[PDB]
Structure formats: C-alpha cells, structure tokens
C-alpha cells in the first residue's frame, strides 16, 4: 500500500485495491488495522488509478478505433501526454527507496497535479466515444476544449491537436501535391 | 548492467517499450503468413500482405 499503491497506480491491480469494472480501483473498506480516514485518502488516490487503467485499456483496445487513422493519431498523442504521470511515479519509487517511512500526504501532494489533468481529458475521450466522432471532427472536438482554462489542460490538449494535425497535413501533402487522395473511410 | 545501479520490473518494462511496440506488429503480420497449400499461393499471399500492411502505416 506503499508499494502496492504505486503498483495499482501503475495500472496493475491487486486484491487490496480490488479492480472492479464498475467501481474501478476499490478498497474493500473493512480492515481492522487501518481505519476510515486513510481509506478516504486511498479512495481519492484510486480515482487517478481508475482513470489510468481506463486510459490504458482504451489505448490498448483502440490504437484503429472501430477501424482507422485519425483516432489512431489521438491515442499516439494520448500515451505521450500521460507519460509524466509514469515518470513522476518512478520518481516516487526512488524517494521511497531513499527513506523508509514517507506518508500518503507526501504522495498526495506530489500527485495532486495529475489529480486535475486526468478527469479533464476523460471528457475529451468520452465525447469521441459517445457521438461516434468520425475522422476530422475529432480535430474540432479537441479544439473546442483547447479553449480550456486550466493552463496545464490547455497545453496537454494542444500537444494532441499538434500530433493529429500531423496526419491531416500528411494527407493534404498527398492530394495538394501529387493529386491523389489516400483515404479509406476516413476523410 | 544487472551483474555489474538499481533495476526493477517497472524500469525494465519502460526501457523495453519501443521494442514491445514493434513486436506486436510482428504478431499481426506473421499471423497472415502462418494461417495459409500450393507453393505459389502461400508465397504470393505472404508477399502481398506486406505491401498492404505498410500502406496501412503511411
């Protein structure tokens, strides 16, 4: 729960932090040795691990959404945006390697900057799944939230927009230059 | 560097990320080259799958 917590936040669950497809990461709430307050802090941290497991499942499942290229560019942006969360977890591992007794409030203060960025990008993925957002409308969908107003969230979605603008410019440098379209069922 | 710095599971998997990405492509490319009887169709289908699969990745 010092190493099991970094392991469950790494996206590999375990039967303290019981993975449930409904309740994400869930502590099993009845423990005679810990007590209800640290349980609440653990649940608060399990929100981040729940979002990370759902993100990695979405990326593994759709790296090729229902089949195709523009959301393929979205996931290649998405894992690279989630990369500093991994590397901050690896830095936590070295600090807990250095000192044998560090608090959860230590971990909470270090990971409360990703505690915001993850629920903000969840709605960006959720609109694409719900409205069956096909092809170039994903470009508009991430841009209407690129007017975000959390400045980390605005910059993090800007990286994704630049990535999938890469494949937009790639198709445009085919049809404007050599006169041929290169598109199967996306446009 | 195991036998001669600390090293764990969570470091070696993130170190081998750009290799475990490339192996998953081979699991799908070879799967069409193993699923088939004549010697001309077994080579023609294999060589054609590669030319289709890279045009997927352009």
């Amino acid at each position: 729960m010092i190493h099991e917590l970094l392991l469950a936040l790494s996206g590999y669950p375990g039967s303290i932090f019981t993975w449930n497809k409904r309740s994400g990461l869930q502590v099993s709430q009845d423990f005679p040795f810990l007590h209800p307050s640290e349980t609440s802090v653990l649940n608060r941290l399990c929100r981040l691990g729940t979002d990370y497991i759902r993100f990695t499942e979405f990326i593994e499942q759709y790296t090729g959404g229902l089949h195709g290229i523009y959301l393929r560019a979205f996931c290649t942006g998405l894992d690279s945006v989630l990369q500093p969360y991994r590397q901050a977890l690896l830095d936590l591992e070295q600090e807990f390697l250095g000192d044998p007794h560090l608090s959860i409030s230590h971990v909470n203060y270090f990971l409360d900057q990703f505690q915001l960025l993850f629920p903000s990008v969840m709605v960006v993925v959720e609109q694409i799944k719900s409205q069956k957002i096909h092809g170039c409308q994903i470009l508009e969908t991430v841009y209407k939230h690129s007017c975000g107003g959390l400045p980390p969230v605005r910059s993090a979605l800007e990286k994704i927009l630049a990535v999938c603008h890469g494949v937009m410019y790639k198709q445009l440098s085919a049809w404007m230059l050599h006169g041929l379209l290169l598109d199967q069922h996306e446009e | 560097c195991i036998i001669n710095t600390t090293i764990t599971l969570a470091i070696v998997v993130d170190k081998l990320a750009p290799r475990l990405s490339q192996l998953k492509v081979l699991h799908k490319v070879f799967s069409t080259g193993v699923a088939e009887t004549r010697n001309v169709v077994r080579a023609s289908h294999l060589l054609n799958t590669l030319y289709k699969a890279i045009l997927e990745y352009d």
Partner: peptide, 23 residues
C-alpha cells in the same frame, strides 16, 4: 580522520529486498 575516510568511493547498488542500509 573519519571525515577523511568519509570522502571514499561509494557503491551505488540497491535491491528491493534490501531497503535499510543496503550499499
């Protein structure tokens, strides 16, 4: 003398099964 020996070359090795004083 001991702070002079303290300027030594340190071993930067570590394991997971050795947490406390593991050079």
């Amino acid at each position: 003398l001991w702070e002079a020996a303290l300027t030594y070359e340190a071993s930067k090795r570590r394991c997971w099964e050795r947490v406390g004083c593991p050079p």
